[PDB]
Design a protein around this nucleic acid. Structure first.
Lengths: 77, 86, 74, 852, 79
RNA sequence: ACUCUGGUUUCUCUUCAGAUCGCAUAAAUCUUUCGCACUAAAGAUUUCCGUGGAGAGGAACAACUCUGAGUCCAAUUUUUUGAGGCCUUGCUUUGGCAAGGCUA
């Protein structure tokens, strides 16, 4: 078990953002954080590289196209 | 055998350059076998790394908090300094 | 080990999928596999010009899978 | 903030960070029957999350149950809140607010206080005793409070080290327990969505003594860790429910191969547990190292020298590890404050979800209007100041912040029961230590300081200069009724004020306690039993008021009723000699009062549905089903007020002007009652006639309320009056031989044994009985002493049953100090109570009439 | 629950003309009747033809072996 | 998978010890209490019966069990590549950088 997968699984229940390789940044509640980097959120705000933002009732990005993820640092301390 | 090369830079503020060209400077508090890093107090800058910049040292700097750099897009890493007491 | 993707809640629901090369499809998930191979029943690929072409049920690989967006209530 | 705190696995900053995210918070109440392991389970969790805290080899350390009386008795008395950060199966840490409630039935009110500020219930059931009385009562109360329910089958080791059941028989016992719980839930809940089964993860098997906590998912993950190739979720799906395993095909099938293979649960879960326990307890010195190596557990030489019980605890801690099964069970099935806010507002908030503020609270957003709701009052060690404990439903409470605290009588029309107070400090409430924090976001439990002054039982904390339409939360509806009545006085009257202060304090410490002063200046405390009142008086003597206090012998609060209609239509006029009201009283139908009490009918319903119900269920006339005015003294009171005045004789519009006054008089009269100033129960009052003065100033106010009470009293008295004793339900867990002896005890206390069924899978029997509460004093002690302590009983209020005697019988002679025979017990119960209240020697049937 | 491997096996057994899209190259795809598949996603297409949507040209190659890494999505076609 | 401490047994001394120092239980003295004090309670002190902890010293035979410390993965989802080439705009640190449209 990796420290990053454990931090992604422990980051569920709070608000966090995830930017993919194509620049699409989806921010919302981490509903499902799988061990393969699959991030499923509900009611996530997705902003693409062009600058347009949209809202999704349920989004699910695979771990193969994951670039970075920003979660809260209050749980690490 | 020892594996202390990853633990020597653990808990210190390092600035890593990813494959996309961005520079993330943060406290490397987490690692893994896949090269996935965890940066506490991580700041991402895409313009240039500020090293004695006369005109400006921070251009396009965005603070994230607990950033999770994926090991698939990792290119190289550089050490910046030791971590704080808090 | 070798767990499949989270497709139980999105199975049998009309949602959109993003494939590599800027591809966009919309259909009902009839099932998934362990290698990310999912079945899209009634798939309609939306082209870049705006028109959508219905291709029916197809098999989408997990390598070029960008992201899925549920168009219904889970 | 920054303060000294004990060493813990996580960090306080992480705990504070988890509080902000309402999706990772679980408000859990660990309820169950007496001594079923809830406190030991909480202690196991604390040991897991606190490296420096370790359970003694001989004494089962209890992190909760911090009171001195709790330590001496060994019985949990007050709910203890504990906020921890627990890792899940996947490793994701969740914030857990656990309200360890007492298991004793007398303190069931305490559990209610822990059910208002919780979203999920974990019911602990002994694997040996099974489902007991308090488990059934708590299931009914939880599913009636709209709470998610999960089950922890504690003390599975008793199936292995006490009963020595075969593994298949242990599986049968567990399955029977689960089936019985499911049947109880289905009986108390119309919806069948919440089926409980370990396949769904709703059920966890635990042994808090030896720290053996596991669910199907967790133990399947143990298999996944020891053998990587297996996926734990599907395996956990296949582990339970009479699904056999074929090792020739390595496949799980409902058809049993070889006709001798055990189930998946027995083969994969139960049998390895039996082997571990038997190797530790039987073959330690000769064959423990081999099995320890096979399990990957390595123990030091000093660790292997421990006694058998500590060695079992250590081995099972090393094997099962953290209590991740409990975390799964409470994460997948218990809603978070975000998810579970809507049912809580719909059930408890008076304004309802449809209100704007109800919609605001449905989101449980930290950045909203403050709507904290505290249901507990925790006294400090010195006992001077009280901290109000409760969850924050919206907004965020800050230390040193002005606050409007609303009492139980606060309404929009009358806001007098509200006080502006300054919050002193805020603590996150762990059991033996408190983490001082600057703020607490919505969806978390908090010990507000400085708001204890304007509240006795229940509070509604909100912010001032805002929420002008904010209403209070409904006061705690209690599982049982407080009956046992004791008079309390000081030894030295010069120190009377101290006791008075103490009374106030106990009124704050015990949610269901009722302290008042009767007409004779006698201070009265109402409790649910003898242990409850013992704890109350210990607190009153040692914690709050350090004075010597005399306590009268315990008596019960009787009820008043009628058995047949009034002989003549009673009537009363106002002191103005106008506004004549003519009424009669008749008994209600069987079960109608039970329907009213159990919220089956509500006066808040519209006229159409209420009339339809009263016309179809009890076959009332349409006019009689639509003329009902009010339900008894309080909301949903056992009595009923109806007006049979035909519109031809009485103007309905004019009567409606005095309808509020007449209803107030009815409620007051039913609350007081004319026999011995006791609640009037199961009586139907019909308004036969009503003259009303046309001018407003000659009616209403102090004219019609006392007149209505007088006419209610006359109608009740002319109808044949009777007294209701409170009858307790008693469950005795006794050995097979002692059952007969139990009857003997209940022979001497007017006890009727209803059933004496055995406990399946256990060598004991559960003797159920219906004993009068007035005769129940010392019955527990009598039963335990007569049977050499082998028989234990728990008594809880069940119903009201008419006393055999006739209260209005002046011919009966009663010696001052003699146990009266049954045929006139009511005559003894009416006059003596009349002397305790301070009223006259006896009441006459024409006392409240107008002719004499 | 219709999996993708079972649907691919049914499409290979039916002998219908299916079109496969290239992974990271949407301007040109392949089309043909796959006779069988492999465990690594490699299929044997009979009468394979590369169709480029940009130029509207079709180049046939015959019996071809398509790797599982280059094909991203596969759909059914009437022709 | 290779090195190095911490060994056990017994004797004696010193010191701490409110720990059930003790899963047992005595004696004395004083005060107090009502009887009128083996046949009696309370409070306190002290002495005996003998322990635990730590340290020191002695001598007996064991020296690395333990406690530790020092020391098999190229075919999706991360580490055995969709990888490289073309054009325009702002600055040119005239190397090229930043963005977009492509071909692959």
């Amino acid at each position: 078990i990796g420290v990053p997968i454990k931090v992604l699984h422990e980051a569920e229940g709070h608000i966090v953002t995830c930017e993919t390789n194509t620049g699409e940044v989806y921010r919302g509640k981490l509903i499902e954080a799988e061990d393969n980097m699959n991030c499923q959120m509900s009611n996530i705000t997705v902003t693409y590289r062009d600058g347009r933002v949209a809202q999704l009732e349920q989004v699910y990005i695979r771990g193969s196209k994951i670039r970075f993820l920003i979660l809260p640092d209050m749980l690490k301390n | 055998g020892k594996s202390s090369k990853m633990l020597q830079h653990i808990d210190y503020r390092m600035r890593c350059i990813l494959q996309d060209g961005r520079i993330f400077i943060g406290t490397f508090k987490a690692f893994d076998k896949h090269m996935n890093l965890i940066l506490c107090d991580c700041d991402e800058f895409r313009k240039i790394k500020p090293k004695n910049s006369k005109q400006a040292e921070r251009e396009e700097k965005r603070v994230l908090g607990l950033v999770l750099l994926r090991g698939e897009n990792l290119v190289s890493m550089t050490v910046e300094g030791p971590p704080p007491k808090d | 080990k070798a767990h499949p993707p989270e497709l139980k809640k999105f199975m049998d629901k009309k949602l959109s999928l993003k494939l590599n090369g800027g591809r966009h499809v919309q259909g009902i998930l009839r099932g998934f596999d362990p290698f990310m191979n999912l079945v899209i029943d009634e798939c309609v690929e939306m082209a870049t010009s705006g028109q959508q072409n219905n291709i029916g049920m197809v098999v989408i690989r997990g390598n070029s899978i960008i992201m899925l967006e549920a168009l219904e209530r889970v | 903030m920054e303060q000294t705190l004990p060493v813990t696995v996580y960090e306080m900053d992480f705990l504070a960070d988890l509080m902000d995210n309402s999706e990772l918070i679980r408000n859990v109440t660990l309820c169950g029957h007496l001594h079923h392991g809830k406190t030991c389970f909480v202690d196991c969790l604390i040991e897991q999350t606190h490296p420096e805290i370790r359970k003694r080899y001989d004494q089962d350390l209890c992190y909760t149950d911090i009171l001195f009386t709790e330590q001496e008795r060994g019985v949990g008395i007050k709910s203890t809140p504990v906020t921890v950060v627990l890792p899940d199966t996947k490793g994701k840490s969740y914030l857990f607010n656990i309200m360890d409630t007492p298991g004793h039935v007398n303190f069931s009110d305490e559990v209610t206080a822990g059910l208002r500020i919780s979203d999920g219930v974990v019911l602990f059931i002994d694997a040996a005793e099974g489902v007991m009385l308090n488990t059934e009562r708590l299931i009914k109360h939880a599913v009636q409070e709209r709470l998610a329910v999960t089950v922890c089958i504690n003390k599975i080791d008793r199936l292995i080290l006490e009963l020595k059941l075969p593994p298949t028989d242990a599986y049968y016992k567990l399955r029977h327990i689960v089936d019985e719980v499911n049947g109880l839930i289905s009986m108390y809940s119309t919806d069948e969505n919440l089926i409980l089964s370990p396949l769904l993860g709703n059920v966890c098997f635990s042994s808090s003594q030896y720290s053996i906590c596991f669910t199907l998912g967790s133990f399947a993950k143990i298999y996944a860790d020891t053998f990587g190739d297996i996926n734990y979720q599907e395996f956990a799906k296949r582990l339970w429910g009479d699904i056999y395993f074929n090792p020739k095909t390595r496949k799980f099938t409902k058809k049993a191969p070889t006709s001798s293979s055990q189930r998946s649960f027995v083969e994969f879960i139960l049998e390895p547990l039996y082997k571990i326990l038997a190797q530790v307890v039987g073959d330690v010195d000769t064959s423990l190292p081999r099995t320890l190596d096979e399990l990957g557990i390595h123990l030091t030489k000093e660790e292997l020298k421990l006694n058998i019980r500590p060695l079992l605890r250590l081995v099972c801690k090393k094997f099962f590890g953290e209590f991740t099964g409990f975390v799964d069970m409470c994460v997948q099935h218990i809603p978070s404050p975000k998810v579970g806010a809507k049912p809580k507002i719909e059930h408890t908030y008076t304004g309802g979800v449809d209100s704007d503020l109800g919609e605001a609270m449905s989101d449980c957003d930290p950045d909203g209007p403050l709507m904290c709701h505290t249901t507990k009052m925790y006294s400090t060690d010195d006992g001077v100041q009280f901290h109000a404990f409760g969850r924050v439903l919206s907004g965020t409470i800050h230390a040193g912040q002005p606050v409007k605290v609303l009492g139980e009588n606060y309404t929009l029309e009358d806001e007098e029961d509200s006080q502006i107070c300054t919050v002193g400090r805020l603590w996150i409430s762990v059991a033996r230590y408190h983490i001082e924090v600057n703020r607490v976001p919505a969806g978390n439990w908090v010990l507000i300081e400085g708001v204890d002054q304007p509240i006795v039982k229940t509070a509604t904390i909100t912010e001032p200069r805002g929420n002008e339409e904010a209403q209070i939360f409904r006061p705690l509806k209690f599982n049982t009724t407080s009956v046992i009545k004791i008079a309390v006085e000081p030894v030295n009257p010069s120190e009377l004020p101290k006791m008075l202060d103490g009374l106030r304090k106990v009124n704050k410490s015990y949610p269901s306690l009722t302290t008042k002063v009767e007409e004779s200046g006698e201070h009265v405390i109402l409790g649910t039993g003898e242990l409850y009142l013992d704890c109350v008086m210990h607190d009153l003597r040692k914690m709050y008021s350090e004075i010597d206090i005399k306590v009268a012998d315990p008596v019960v609060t009787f009820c008043e009723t009628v058995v047949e209609t009034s002989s003549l239509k009673c009537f009363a006029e106002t002191p103005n000699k106008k506004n004549k009201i003519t009424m009669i009283a008749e008994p209600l139908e069987k079960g109608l009062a039970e329907d009213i009490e159990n919220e089956v009918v509500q006066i808040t319903w519209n006229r159409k549905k209420l009339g339809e119900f009263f016309q179809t269920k009890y076959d009332w006339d349409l006019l009689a089903a639509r003329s009902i005015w009010a339900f008894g003294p309080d909301a949903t009171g056992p009595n009923i007020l109806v007006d049979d005045t035909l519109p031809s004789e009485v103007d309905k519009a004019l009567l409606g002007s005095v309808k509020d006054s007449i209803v107030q008089g009815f409620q007051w009269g039913t609350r007081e009652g004319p026999l011995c100033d006791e609640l009037i129960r199961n009586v139907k009052f019909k308004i036969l006639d009503a003259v009303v003065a046309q001018e407003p100033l000659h009616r209403g106010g102090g004219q019609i309320i006392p007149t209505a009470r007088r006419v209610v009293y006359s109608a009740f008295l002319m109808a044949t009056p009777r007294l209701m004793e409170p009858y307790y339900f008693v469950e005795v867990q006794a050995p097979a031989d002692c059952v007969s002896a139990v009857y003997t005890v209940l022979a001497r206390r007017r006890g009727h044994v209803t059933q004496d069924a055995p406990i399946p899978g256990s060598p004991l029997y559960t003797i159920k009985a219906f004993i009068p509460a007035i005769d129940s004093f010392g019955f527990e002690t009598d039963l335990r002493t007569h049977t050499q302590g082998q028989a234990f009983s728990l008594s809880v209020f069940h119903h009201w049953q008419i006393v055999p005697g006739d209260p209005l019988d002046k011919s009966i002679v009663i010696r001052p100090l003699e146990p009266q025979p049954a045929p006139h017990l009511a005559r003894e119960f009416m006059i003596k109570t009349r002397r305790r209240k301070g009223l006259s020697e006896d009441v006459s049937i024409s006392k409240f009439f107008d002719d004499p | 629950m219709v999996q993708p491997i079972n649907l691919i096996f049914r499409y290979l057994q039916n002998r219908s003309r299916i079109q496969v899209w290239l992974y990271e190259q949407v301007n040109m795809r392949i089309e043909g009747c796959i006779i069988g598949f492999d465990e690594y996603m490699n299929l044997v297409l009979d009468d394979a033809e590369e169709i480029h949507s940009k130029t509207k040209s079709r180049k046939q190659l015959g019996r071809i072996m398509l790797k599982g890494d280059n094909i991203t999505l596969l759909q059914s076609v009437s022709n």
